[model samples]
Target chain A: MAMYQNMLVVIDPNQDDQPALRRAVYLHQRIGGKIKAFLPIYDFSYEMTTLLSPDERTAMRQGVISQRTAWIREQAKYYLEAGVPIEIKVVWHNRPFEAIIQEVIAGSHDLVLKMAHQADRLEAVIFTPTDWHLLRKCPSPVWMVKDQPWPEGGKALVAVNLASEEPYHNALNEKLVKETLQLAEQVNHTEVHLVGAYPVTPINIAIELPEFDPSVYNDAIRGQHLLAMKALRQKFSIDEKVTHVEKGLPEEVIPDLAEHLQAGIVVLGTVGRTGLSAAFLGNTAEQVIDHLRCDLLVIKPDEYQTPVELD
Target chain B: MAMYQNMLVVIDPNQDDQPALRRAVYLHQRIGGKIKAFLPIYDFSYEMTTLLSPDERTAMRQGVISQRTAWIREQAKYYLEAGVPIEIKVVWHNRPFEAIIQEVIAGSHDLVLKMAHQADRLEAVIFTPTDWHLLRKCPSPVWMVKDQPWPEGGKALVAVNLASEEPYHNALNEKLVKETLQLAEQVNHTEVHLVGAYPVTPINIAIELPEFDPSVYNDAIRGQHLLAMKALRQKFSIDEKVTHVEKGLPEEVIPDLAEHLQAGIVVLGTVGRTGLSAAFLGNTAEQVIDHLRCDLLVIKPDEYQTPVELD
Candidate 1:
C-alpha cells in the first residue's frame, strides 16, 4: 500500500466538521504526512451581479475567504497540539467542487478526505451532487468518511474487477490491494479481504454471434479470474478463505459482500468508462452506495482525466 | 387520458396478479373496447440448448406458451363477465422486456400498462429496470400502476417540459394534458394539474457566448413556461391555480410536486435522448420514482425508436 505524503481535507461549510479534521490527523499520525485543509466558500448574494459591481463582488468573496481562513487557522490548534504540522487555506468560488479540485491539482495532493452525510444504522450514506461530482471528476483518491468510528482490527475489503483484459487491469487490482493493506496495517493488523467480481457473458451475445457460446465464455472468464486471484494470493498475505471470486455485476456483488462483512471500509477502482459502460456507471455507483453502509475509498487509475472544467 | 381502444396488459407469470387485468378490463368496460392479456414466460432450463435439440426447444416453448395462454383465459372470466371482450396471447422469450415490446407492435396496442412495485403508505413507489425500459423504449404510452388505488377526486399531474424550442414541444404537452383530463373525467372529475420544469442555462454556455446572460435566460425561460401554462389553461379549461411552473431539474421538481399534491397519477413526456442526456435519463426517472408515490404514465414523443432488436 502506498502511504500518503500529502493529504487534503475538504471542510463542509454546512456543518461543524471536526470529525473530518480529526480523521485527517489520524492518517497524518500514522503516516507522518503533511496536511492541508481546503475550505471553499460562497455566498448566495454573490450571484446578484446587477446589484453588486465587480469590485463589490470581489470584496464579498475576499471577506468570506478571509473569515473562513481565520476560522480554520483558529481550529488548527487542535491538530497542532497533537504535534501535526498543517496548512489551512480557503478559496472563494461560485462552484465549491471546481475550487477544491483546483486546490488538489495546484497542491499535488494524493488524498482528499471529505466528511459525507453520516448515515445512521438505518440510513444509508447520502451523497450530494457536489460529492457525486467530486467522486466522478476528482484526480486524486477521495476518502468519503462516514460518521462511524473506524473500528480497530476490523475487516477491510478490496473490491477488484478481474473480468477485463485491459492493459492496466491487473496493475489496478494490485494497487487496490496495496492501498487496502496500508489502511489495514494502520488499524493494527486488521484482517484484509481481497474480492473480485466477474461478469457473466450475456446470452444475447450467443444469440447474435452464431459462433459465440456464452457458456464457453463464462467458463473461460471464471478460469482467468481464478488465476488472477491465485496470483494476488501469491503476492499478498490475504487469507485464502477471505479471497472471493464471484459471478455477478461488480456494483451489486462488492456492496453485498461489504455489507455482509461489516467492513471498516471498502476500496474501489473507478476507471472512466466510455459509451454504453459510461451510461451504466453513474447509477451503478449510486446503487452500490445504497448498500455500502461503511466508509468508501474510491481510487482512479493513473490515466483518468477529470470530466470537469479546470478554469 | 385518451380512450384506449385496444389496451395491452402485461401479466406477471410468477404471481397471480388480477389487479392489472382488472385495470385493463375496467378501462375496456368503460369504453366497450377490446382488451388483451399478455403473459411472457421463460425458464432458465431452456438455456441448456446443448442438452435439448432445436425441435425439443420449440416444443418446450410452445408448451409453456399454451399453458400460460390457457391460464390467462381461465382467469379472464372475471373480466369477460364485465362485458369486456378480451384476447390472450403468450410469447416465449429470454428477455421479457423485448417480448412485451414485440407484442405492442404486433397487436397495435394504444397503451402499455404494467404493474410495478407498489409503495406502502409511508414508503414511496419503486420502479424496476424493466419498468424503466418500457417507459423509454415502448412506442405507446407506458402506464406503471402501483397497488395504490386511483383515489376519488385526487390530483392528476401532467408534467411537461415547455422550455425546449423543439417543434413538437407544445403539441406533446397538449397531448399529455388531454390524456390526463380524460382520466380525470372518468374518476368523477378528479382534479387536474399542469406542471412544467425549466433548467437555467448552463454557466458554460454563458461563458462561451458573451451575449448569453444566465439571469436573463433563466427569467425568460420561466416567463415562457408561465405563458405556455396560461395558454394551456385557456384552451383546455384548466384552472390557473392548478398550474405549476418551477425552476430546477425536471426530475427533481416533478416528483416533489407530485408528492406534495398526493397525485393519483403523474404523466410525463420522455423524448428518448441521445449521448449524455440518455445516460442521465434512466437515473432521472429513477430519482423521480424515489419521491413519486402515485402511478406514473411515461409517454414517448412520436420520434422515439426502440433500441431493442426486432425481427
Candidate 2:
C-alpha cells in the first residue's frame, strides 16, 4: 500500500504563490495519491454587516466560502482536468490551525502539505502560528513547502536523537531512517544521510565542579552515542561516510549538517505533545525548525494522539 | 543632532551576508552615526576541555571572543577605513539574547540593528529567539534588516494604534509617526504613509447577542478611530490619501496595507514589557512584525526599561 494514500493540502488565500498545491501535485505525480484541498476562512468585515439577519449573515459567510472554494478549484483545476483524484473542501472558521487539525482528524489524512510563508532569504525558519500549531499537534506528518523547487539529487538528512536510551527515542530514530529511506527511494537520485548529535557535559556541571574532568565525561558521552549510532548503522547498512556523529545540540548539529549537504528535506520526528509537556518534548524540534533553511517533513510516532479535539 | 547617534549592531557569524551591518552603514551614510558591532560567542566544545584548569578554560573562552572580535572588525573594515566611526566588541556568553540586551543597556544605544536569519522567500517574517528578545525587552529601537535593499522612492508605513484612548497608546502613535518621518527625511525619495487599524465588534459578542446590531457598534468604533487618526494627521500635516484607517485586526490590516503600498520599512511601537505584561502590550507589534515583508523599525516608549541588568 502507498504510505501517503491520502493527503490534505491546506489552501491559503493570503499566499499568492500556492507552493503547497504545487508541492502536492509534484508528490502526487511521483507517489500516485489522492489529495483533499482544505481551506478555512473567515472575514471580520462580514461580521460587521449587522443590518443583516443571522441567516443573512450566514449566507454572506457561505458566499465568501463559496468564492474561496471556487478559487481553490481554479488553483487545482489543471489537476482535476488531468483526471487526478482531488476533493476541494472549504470550512468557515476563524481559528485556522484548530480547524485544520479537526479536518485532519475527520478526514483521516495520512499527510498534510502546506506552503510555509516566505521571510528572510537565508537567516531563519519562520513558521506561522498555524504552522507551529500544526507541527506541535497535527497527528499526521506535516510537510512544509518552501517556494524553491526541491533540488534533484539533493540529500534527505535524517536527524536522530541517540543521547537518550528511552524506547520512545530509539523507536523514533528507526522510524525517521525508515521514512527517509522510503521517501528517498521514490524521489529520483535522492541520497539519504543520518545525523545524531550528542551534547558535551552541561555548562552548570563544568562551572560548579572545578576538579571535574569534563573531557573524561565527554569521551564517555561520545562513546555511548557512537555505540548507538553503530547499531543503527549496522541494521540499516548506512554508509560510514554519510552517517554523522557530531558533538553539539541537536538544534545546531541537525540544521548545520542539512545545510552543509544542501538537503532537499530534513526528515524529523516529533512526539506531537502539547502544553507543558510539549515545552520539553517538542522544544528541540521547534528550535531546529526555526533554524532550518530547507523544506521540513515532521513525523509523529504511530501511537501519538493530537491534543486538538474534534468539534 | 543625529537621531541615531549611538547604534548597536548584533553580529551573527552564522549569516554569511551581514544584513544588519549593511543597513547600519546605509543609515550612517545618510545620517552620520557611530556603529558598535557586538558579537556573543560560546562553544560547547571549549567547555568539554575538562583537562584544562579554570584559568585555561577562561583563556579558551577569551580566545574565541578575540577571534570573533577580529572577524567583526574585518567585516566592518571598509566602513572603518573610510573614517566612519565603528567599534567592534565581542563577549563570551551562551545566551546571545541576554548578552545583546546587556550590551544595549551598557552602551545606551539609541538603536539596535540585527541581521535577521534568512529563511523562506515570500510569506512570513522569521525572528530568532535573540531577535525576539531584543524586540520585546531591549529598550532601544530594534531594526531587523533582511538581505534586501531599501528601495528608492519606497513607502515608509507608520502603523499606529488609534483604537485605544489610553495616554500611553496615544503618545506611542505620535512617536511612531515622528520617528518614521525623521528617518524618511534622511533617506532620499522615501514616501511616508500612516496606517491605523480598528477592530470590529468581538466575534463572541456578535455570536452571543443575536439582537446586537454590530454595524452600530462597529460604526462607533470606526468613528472613534477616524477621530484619532484625524487628530494625528492634522497634527503631523499628513496628506489624506496617504493616511489609512482600515477595519480589521492590526496584524492583518497593517501588513496588508504595507505590502499593498510596497513599503520599504514599517515603523511600529511596542511597550517592550517582558513576562506577563509583554504578552498583552508587546503582542500586537509582534504579530504585525511576523506578517510584514519589508524592513521593520520597532520603537519603545521613552519611559520603558530593559529587563536585563548588567552584571
Candidate 3:
C-alpha cells in the first residue's frame, strides 16, 4: 500500500455538485484510493438581515440554508450507493480556509482535491482562492483540476536548471526529472524530452561599452556558441535535434520553447529562499509558471532524495 | 571574506560597451573582486565570400573587423585608468557559447553578470548561446540584470505553506523563511513578512442535497471556519491587520495579496510529483510566478535545513 492511503475531496454544496462528485469518483477509481468528501456549512445571509425586515431575513436565511443541506445529501447519495466509504463533514464557518486546513491536518489523507472558485465577493479583491493555498501550505499533495479532463496521458517536459550556482542544485534537478519520468512512464506518456536551453555570449563583449565593429567579433561569438552546444550535447548525451539553443531571456524563451514543443507539462526547480532574499533574487522557475499555460511541476533544489556532496 | 572572489564580465565588441563596463566596475568595487573580460573577433563578410566579389568581401570583412577591434580597445582603456587588476581576453571562435563557458570554468569566477540585451539590435537575444547554456548547466550563480537598478535595502519575502499534511513540511517553509530573512538582514534588507494564504469552502445552505437540513449545515461551516481562523491566528500570532483570510484560488490569491501588500518578493513551496500530479498540483506556484509582476521565491518540501525527529 502507498503511504498516501486515501484521498479527500472537498465539495462545494451550493454549485451543481455533479461535476465535482464525478471527478472524485473518477480519481478514486483511477488511483485505487478510498475517497472522503467534506461539505462546509456557513451562515451566508448574515448581511442581508440589515436590508430586509427581521422576519423576512430570518425566513430567507432559513430557506437558503435548508436548500444547501438538501443539495449535499443528494450529491453524497451516489457515493453511498457505490459502496465507497463516505464521510461527510458539515461545519458552520464564515471562513473556509482555516476549517479546511484543520481538516487536512486531522484527516491524515495523502491528497486533497477541490473545485476552483471564490467563496464570496471579496474573492474578487484578491486572486480567487483555490487548492493552491493547500498546495503551498498543506503538507499533503494537492491536485487542482483545471478545465482539462481526468487522466490525459501526454509527454511531461521537466525543466531542470542544471546550471544553478548552488553546489547541490543539479542533484535536485536530476532527482526531479528522474522521478517525473518514472511517473510519466506509469501514466504512459507518449515521449519524454529532456531539454537544455543554452544562452551564449563572449567574455569580452560588454553591453555597456561603446559600439565596436561587427566583422571582427561576429565570427568568434558564433563559433563559441557552436562549441558550447556541442559540449552540452555530449555532456548530457542529449540528441542534438531536441536540444534548443536560444539567445534570449529565460523567462520568455523557456515558455516559448515549452509552447513551441507543445509540452503537456513542465517541471521546474525552486530554491527555498525566504522573505527579502526571495524578493530581490527572484526565482526563475516561479516566473516561468505564470506565463506558461501548460501543467507545471516544481522541485526544491535543496531537498533531493539522494545525498549530494558539495566540494 | 565572502566566498565569491572572482567576477567575469562578458562583453561584445560590436555593441556599445559602456553599460557592461559600468556594471563590471560597480560589481568589482562592491566585492573587491578581480575582473576578467573577453572579446571575440569574427569576419562577418566571410558569408559574403560566396555571394560578393572576392575583393569586396575581403575589404568589407577587414574594415569591419578592424573597426570592431578599435572599439574594443577604447572600452578597455576606461577600465585601465582605474588601475584595478583586470584581464582582457580576445578570441576568435565560431561559437561564442562554448568559448564563454570554457573561459568561465577555466577562470574559476564565482559569479557572472552581463547586460540583458545584445548590440546592433535593441532586442537582440541577451541570453544567447553562452549565457543560456551557462545558466542551464554552469554550477555558478548567473545574474541577468535588466534595467532595474541594484536594489538597496531589499527584504526577502519567503512565502510559506503551513497547510501541508506531509510530516515536517511546515519545517521547510519556516527554515527557508528564516534563512532568507537572515540572508536579507546580512545583505541589509529592512524587514521580512512571513505570509500564508488559505482557501475555505462553506458547506451551509449552498450545497444542494435533498436530505441535509440547511440550518445545521450553515452553522457547522461557520463554526469550523471561525475555529480554523482562530487557530491560525493564535499559532502565528498574526495581527488581524497583517494576516489575510480571503476565499479564492491559491495561485491567484497569494500573488494578488503579495502584490496588493507591495511585497517585494513572494516565496512558495513545491513538491516533487510526476505527470498530471506534477503539472496540476504544481500549477499554483507556477501561476503565482506568471501572474505576479513582483519577484518570486520557491522552496521544495523535500529537505529540511534543521533536523527534526520524524515519525
Candidate 4:
C-alpha cells in the first residue's frame, strides 16, 4: 500500500479540470504520499520555424515549459497551501507517453497516476493513443482515474485468467490478486472480489462428435475453472462468496461483474506487446480496459520488460 | 449526402442496449439508408479444446457464429418488423477489426457505424482497440456514435489541417469540407463550420532573436493558415463567418471550439499509416479524436490503401 508514496501525476495542460491532480491529492490526503505533478509539452511546428536556430528553439521550448509550470503550480495552489507535499515538473518532449515512462524509469516512481482522456464531460473516459502506450510500456503500475470518485464501501474487482497454463499468466494472476488486496487494505471497507471467466464448449462439435457432448465439455471447463479459482481463494484466504467463476469472454465477463458489483476499481494484468507486433496485432486486454466503468490499475507481468528507455 | 446509403453497423452481443443499432435505425429513418448489423466472435478456448479435431473446432466456431446470428436477429427484430431495410451478419473470426474491414471491402459498404464502447451507462464512449483498428484501417468513412442523440439544429464542425503542404492533406482538406457540406445538406438546419488551428511562435525565440521577431513569425504562420482556410472556404463556398483559423495545437483548439459550439459531430481526415511504422510512431490525429465532444466521422486520404485482404 505504501507503494504509492512517491507518485508521478501526469498533467494535461490543455484541460482545466485536471482530474489526475484531484485524484492524486485525495490519495495524498488519505495515505500521506509525496506527489510530483508532471507535464510534457512539444509543438512540432517549433522544429520547422527556420527563422530560429536550434539553441533558440531549445530556449523557446524552455520558455513554454516555464509557462506551463507556472500554470500547473497555480492549479495546485489549493493543495500546496494546505501543506500537501508536492513537486511540479515540466519537460520538452516530442512524445508525451515516452516522456512520462522515462520519468518513471529515471525517478523510480512507485506509481503513475493519470486521468483517462474523455471526449466529452461526464462521458466515458476513452483511452487515448497515449493512454494505450502508457498502459503497455510504463514500468510503474499506471492508475487511470475517471472524474468519478470511488463510492464508499465500493468493491475492488480483481480480474484473473485462471484458464491460461502460461507461466506468465499464473505469475500475473498472483501479482494482480496480491496487489489488489494490499491496495484495498489501505481504504476502509473496500471489499475484494475475484473473477475467473472461462469458455463454453462449441455446440456444433458437441453434436457432430456424439462422443463429445457440449454440456459435458462445458461442465468440465466450468469445473476446472472453479478448481483454479478455489486454489487462488485458498492461497489468498479469500471468502468463497466474493469469488466468481463465470463462462464468457474476459472482456464481457469482467465489465459485467464490475458493474454488478459497482466496483470502485478493476485491477488487471497485461502481457503487453511491443514494437511492430503491437501495432499490427491489436490487444484484447485493451477491450476489457475500455469496458471498465470505474478507475483502473494496470499491472505488468513480473518479468515483463518495458520498451521505453531514459535518455 | 448519399454516401451513407449503405451503412454497416457493428454489433456488440454482450451489451443489451445496442447504441450502434439505435443510431443506425435513426439514420435509416432520416436518410433512407440500408443497414447491415455486423457481429464477429471468436473464443480462443475453442482452439484449446484438445478433445476436438481440427474439423470439430471449425464446426464449433460455426456453431458459435450461428448462435450469435440468431441473437443479433432477435436484437434487430423491432427494426426488421418495421421494414427498415436491415441485414444481419455474424462471422467466426479471431480479429474483429479485420473482419469488419474485410466485410467493408467485400460488400462495398459506404459507411461504418459503431458505438464507442463505454465502461458504464451514460458515460463517455471510449474507443476500444478494435475501434482504433477500424478507424485506421477501414476504407469506408467511419461514423463513431455515442449513446446520445444528435440534437436538432446541430452544428457539424469540419476540422482541416491547412498548415500541411503534403498533397494528401491538401486533398483531404478539400474532401472533408465538400463531404461535410453535402452531408449537412441532407439534415435540415445543420450548420457547418471550418477550423484550421495553427501554432504559436516560441516566446524564448521571440526574446532571443533580435533579427527574427517571434511576433512576426507567429503572425506569418497565422496569416498563411487563414489564407489556406480562406482558399478552402472559397472552394466549398463556405460562409466566412462560419470559418475560423486559430493558433494552438490542433488537439487543444479543435475540442475547445467543438464544446463552445456544442457541435453534434466533427468531421476530420487521417492519413493513417498501414504497417509496422504505425505501431512504433503514434498518430497525432488520434489526440484530436480523443478530445472530441461530439460524434466523429473519420475519413482516410483518397489514395489510402487498406492492409486487410478479403480471403
lDDT of each: 0.70, 0.75, 0.48, 0.76
In model 4, the Cα lDDT at residue A252 comes to: 58
Higher-lDDT candidate of 1 and 2: 2
Pairs with backbone N, CA or C atoms under 3 Å apart (clashes), candidate 4:
A123-B123, A123-B124, A124-B123, A124-B124
In model 2, how well does chain A match by TM-score? 0.92
Q: What is the per-residue lDDT of model 1 for residues A1-311, given as tens digits with 9 covering 90 to 100?
A: 44778899988765665567778888887877888988875323232222335764565455556666777777777677766878888775656777878888889889988886543554566555556667777889898988777655558888765544444335667888888888778766778898877654245434343455667766776777888888887798766899888876666588778777778788877666542234234444555664567788888777777776767
Clashing pairs in 2: A117-B123, A117-B124, A118-B122, A118-B123, A118-B124, A122-B118, A123-B117, A123-B118, A124-B117, A124-B118
Candidate 4 CAPRI assessment class: incorrect
Best by DockQ: 4
- lDDT tens digits, residue span B1-311, model 4: 46688899999866767888888787777788898899876436352363457887777666666777877888888889989988888876667788899888888888898886534433434677678878878889998987676766779998887764533335777888888887787766589999987766545636665576667788888888888888889987888999988877677688888877878889978764552223212344677776665788998766678878877
Task: Output the worst ten-in-a-row residue range by lDDT, candidate 1 chain B.
Answer: B42-51
| Best candidate, lDDT | 4
DockQ of candidate 1 compared with the true complex: 0.06
In the range B1-311, model 2's lDDT, one tens digit per residue, is 67898999888776545788888888788888888888775334343443456776675565566666777888878888998888888876645677888888888888999876434445555666557767777888998887666556779998887755444446777898888888888988588999888766444445445566666667777787788888898898888888898887678798878878888889888774333224333546766877777888998888887778777
On the 0 to 100 scale, the lDDT of residue A259 in model 1 is 70
Error of 4 at B112 (Å): 2.6
Interface RMSD of each: 11.4, 8.1, 17.1, 5.0
lDDT string for model 4 (A84-167, tens) is 988999986767888899898888787899986544433445677778779878878999987677767789998887764543
For all candidates, state DockQ relative to the true structure.
Answer: 0.06, 0.12, 0.03, 0.21
- For candidate 3, the TM-score is 0.39
